[PDB]
Amino acid sequence: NDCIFEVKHEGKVTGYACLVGDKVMKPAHVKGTIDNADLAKLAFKRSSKYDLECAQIPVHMKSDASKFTHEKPEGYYNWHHGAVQYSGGRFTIPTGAGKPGDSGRPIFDNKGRVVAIVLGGANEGARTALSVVTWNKDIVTKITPEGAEEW
Amino acid sequence: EIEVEGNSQLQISFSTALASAEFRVQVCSTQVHCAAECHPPKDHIVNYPASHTTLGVQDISATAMSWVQKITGGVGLVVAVAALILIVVLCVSFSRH
Amino acid sequence: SVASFVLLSMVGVAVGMCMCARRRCITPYELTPGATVPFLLSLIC
Numbered sequence: 001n002d003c004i005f006e007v008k009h010e011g012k013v014t015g016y017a018c019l020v021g022d023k024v025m026k027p028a029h030v031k032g033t034i035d036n037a038d039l040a041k042l043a044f045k046r047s048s049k050y051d052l053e054c055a056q057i058p059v060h061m062k063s064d065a066s067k068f069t070h071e072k073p074e075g076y077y078n079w080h081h082g083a084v085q086y087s088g089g090r091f092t093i094p095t096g097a098g099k100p101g102d103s104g105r106p107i108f109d110n111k112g113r114v115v116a117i118v119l120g121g122a123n124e125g126a127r128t129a130l131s132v133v134t135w136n137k138d139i140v141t142k143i144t145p146e147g148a149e150e151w
Numbered sequence: 152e153i154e155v156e157g158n159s160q161l162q163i164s165f166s167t168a169l170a171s172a173e174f175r176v177q178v179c180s181t182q183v184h185c186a187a188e189c190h191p192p193k194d195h196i197v198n199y200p201a202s203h204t205t206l207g208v209q210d211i212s213a214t215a216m217s218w219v220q221k222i223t224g225g226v227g228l229v230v231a232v233a234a235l236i237l238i239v240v241l242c243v244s245f246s247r248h
Numbered sequence: 249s250v251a252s253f254v255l256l257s258m259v260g261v262a263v264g265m266c267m268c269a270r271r272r273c274i275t276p277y278e279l280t281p282g283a284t285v286p287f288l289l290s291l292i293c
Contacts, residue, residue, distance in 0.1 A: 020281045021281030021282065021283075022281065022283060023281055025279065045275070045278055045279070047275045047279060049244070049275075050276075050279060052279055054278065054279050068281045068282075070282070135280050135281070135282075137280070137282055137284060138276075138277075138280065138284065139247075139276035139277065139280060140276055140279045140280050141247075141248070142248070222255070226255050226258050226259065227258075229258070229259065229262050230258050230261065230262050232262070233261070233262035233263075233265040233266050233269075234265065236265070236266060236269045237265045237266075237268065237269050239269075240268075240269040240272050240273055241272075243273075244272055247276075
């Protein structure tokens, strides 16, 4: 919900970028530019350890920014492709629920707050875990389930 | 060669090109370390070849080379501070995942 | 000339390492939506 922006390299949508708190971010592994010309022209800060590009939202989008929260209890979270199970300190879905090319999708809690952004997934047995980034209030951390494939 | 007897003092003449003359003298297999600050002469040209050898690239500089040591130590300390900060940051980033 | 060049090169190297360390320290904080940073790090930057 207003956390959806298109990125094009061949003219098609390759990844998603959003508005949260006081900043815009997008995964840095998605090729292309933001659909909104106002956001694509900004100066982005780019980090490969977390694979992310970020900038500051202009003032006039104060109504567009969504809430965020670091607290993340055990249980179910919601996103565009159904729902995800976060347990044991790790996000998972069942095997084959995700497909490549959908990266950039944020994960929301029951109140609609962003808690993680997916970059990939890896399937073990009947369940596939998610390699995403999340945030202790202090720093942006990345969780990878012993390796995962990029989306 | 010198003539020596009892407890006394002896005078020797020497020549050098070093600004700070730090050397050792052997007399009857006994070594003494002599040190001095030398001053340049006022006569520009002489009619006889130099009795001392030229100074090379190792036995160089004067006693006031401590400026070189001080500047090298200061720059090395700055470099060490920068390298220590870089090492700390790299260790933090490697430990963090 | 070579001594001045070496000293200036070492100074530039130290400056570059300090900038790299500062950017690596600041990067985790400019990507968290909460605008939180220790005051000591702010004084450093």
